[PDB]
Amino acid sequence: ASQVRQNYHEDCEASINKQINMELYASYVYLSMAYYFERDDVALPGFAKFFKESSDEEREHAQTFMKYQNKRGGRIVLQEIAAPSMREWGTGLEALQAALDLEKQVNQSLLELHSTASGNNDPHLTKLLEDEYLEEQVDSIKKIGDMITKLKRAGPHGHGEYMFDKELN
Amino acid sequence: ASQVRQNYHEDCEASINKQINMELYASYVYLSMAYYFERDDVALPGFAKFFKESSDEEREHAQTFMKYQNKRGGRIVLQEIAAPSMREWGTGLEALQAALDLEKQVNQSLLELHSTASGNNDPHLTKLLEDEYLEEQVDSIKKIGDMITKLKRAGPHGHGEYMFDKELN
Amino acid sequence: ASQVRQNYHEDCEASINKQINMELYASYVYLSMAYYFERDDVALPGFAKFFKESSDEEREHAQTFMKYQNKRGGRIVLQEIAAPSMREWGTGLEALQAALDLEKQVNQSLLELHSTASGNNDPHLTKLLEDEYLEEQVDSIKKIGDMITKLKRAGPHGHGEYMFDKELN
Amino acid sequence: ASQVRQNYHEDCEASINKQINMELYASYVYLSMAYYFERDDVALPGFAKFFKESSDEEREHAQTFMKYQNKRGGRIVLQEIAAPSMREWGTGLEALQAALDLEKQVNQSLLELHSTASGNNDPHLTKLLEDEYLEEQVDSIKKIGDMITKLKRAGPHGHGEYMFDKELN
Ligand SMILES: [Fe+3]
Ligand SMILES: [Fe+3]
Ligand SMILES: [Fe+3]
Ligand SMILES: [Fe+3]
Ligand SMILES: [Fe+3]
Ligand SMILES: [Fe+3]
Ligand SMILES: [Fe+3]
Ligand SMILES: [Fe+3]
Ligand code: NI
Ligand code: NI
Ligand code: NI
Ligand code: NI
């Protein structure tokens, strides 16, 4: 085995590889959304900026897990990254609703990975998930929830969507 | 009695203790409102900021009376602080209407305390009420009145409430 | 339910509302102590400063839980804040002994809330309690213990209390 | 009469002349105390500084009334300034107790002058007394009360008086 590996269970190693793929998928969904909102017939630069930054964050989440895998002596296995579920995302509100669903699926996966770590008595891994991932996720879900509520108040279509979009820009 | 006490009547001492409780109550009502407006299903950061600052001010009003009580040789008696009348405050307009009512009840209490001070010929206390409390109160009532009028013009629901909220932020 | 709520159990939600009330109560006890030590017949400005700052901290503890409740999609329920147990706190040593007891009751409550979170497998909440509350509490108990020992050495009455009070100022 | 005099009653004019004399007397008492505490067999520089500054303040109080008399068109009548009641003031505590008594006699006189102004419906004069004199007096009485309590805790004789004196220095 790896000269560094200690108290690192093969189920946790595999779970992190799966989570790496899921973070990359989320990054690619947000990339899709970002450029969707730069179409000449959509033209919502605030939403475009928001989802470009979210896409960058999700890739950084994947890279931190990849670093973590090496840190513990596990081995990174990269799998294909699925095409995003949609090619066109609808309104700003529909994109945020899609993002909220995705963030909660990722949160579900992170909490399941915490349970795996915890059942294998790996406090280094539960600590990683708590400090680096679980709060970022809860904060992100609250933020997107806030945005959905604000957009519904502002608009959520037409004039109000235009003005809300400037808030994000 | 206190070595410092001079021309300080027991009815004024008791009236200030009651006013201390009322200021703290107002601070707690505004604290309630502040975090109500940070709910993911409310999300009005301008209102939240406005009522957080108002809550801080009301606690400062209470502390200034507590300092005053000691300054005159009276003795602070702290009583329980009632729960705020509501747990959920409705729209921004409804919260401002509630604040306006509360500010006028506090103003009524301050004017009654001025009458007590005046009937007991305590010019140090009437001067305190005039310089430190009565104008802050009249200015606050005018401000909240202005905000209600502006919000009714802007909205007061939906799109206009969203845009008015940015004014406060 | 809240659009943001995920893995947030109703017993944890209720426990946080109770803890919010308890933090506010502790803030109000310390407010009482702070101004007690500014009485013309007490006049211990070091103790007064110490308990004013402690009162501010406890309100900040309450506000952080209120923010946390919203962050997770729970709903803040505010209850009446009990009057402090005493109106007059005795010597500086007696106030510190009272503070030590209160800090340990709060610590007990925080540890019980950690057990609730842990039994409901809420690692986001156990992480909150560990990083934001449990160390602040242990550090505060050590500090107050140190102060009690120092005051007993310095005095704890009369001349030594006067000189110890300058340490705090 | 004076070309400027308006709504200025002769009883208020005379009362201010008497108060001018009383402020000067208080300044001279404090001058006495100040240099008493610089005797080679007393040597309390903190008390000496405190009473020098108090003596300066009391002369400034007299000069402000003299300015006020001219401002209203009254005429300053200066009378002899009595010798201080003592030549030797005892301990620091005894001097503070003497100062507290004197400050309260001055406060009594100021409140009587406010009643005179008020009975003659002179709001310019009641406002002068409130803003320029009555709070300075209440603050001074609280300060001296605090000092007496602190000195009694610190000492009030011997070692503790020596150490308390450094607080004032
Ligand atoms: Fe992620
Ligand atoms: Fe995020
Ligand atoms: Fe107030
Ligand atoms: Fe106000
Ligand atoms: Fe606390
Ligand atoms: Fe603490
Ligand atoms: Fe004076
Ligand atoms: Fe003075
Ligand atoms: Ni659609
Ligand atoms: Ni309603
Ligand atoms: Ni006792
Ligand atoms: Ni003597």
Automatic annotation (TrEMBL), chains A, B, C, D:
Entry keyword annotation includes Oxidoreductase: yes
GO biological process: intracellular iron ion homeostasis; iron ion transport
Residues the record lists as binding Fe(3+) 3: 23, 58, 103
Highest taxon above the source species: Eukaryota
Residues annotated to bind Fe(3+) 4: 23, 58, 136
UniProt-listed Enzyme Commission number(s): 1.16.3.1
GO function terms (MF aspect): ferric iron binding; ferrous iron binding; ferroxidase activity
Binding locations of Fe(3+) 7: 58, 103
Start and end residues of each Ferritin-like diiron domain: 6-155
One cellular component term from this protein's GO annotations in UniProt: cytoplasm
Binding-site positions, Fe(3+) 6: 57, 103, 136, 140
Keywords on record: Iron, Iron storage, Metal-binding, Oxidoreductase, Zinc
Catalysis: reaction(s): 4 Fe(2+) + O2 + 4 H(+) = 4 Fe(3+) + 2 H2O
Binding site for Fe(3+) 5: 57-58, 103, 137
Protein name stated in the entry: Ferritin
Organism: Penaeus japonicus
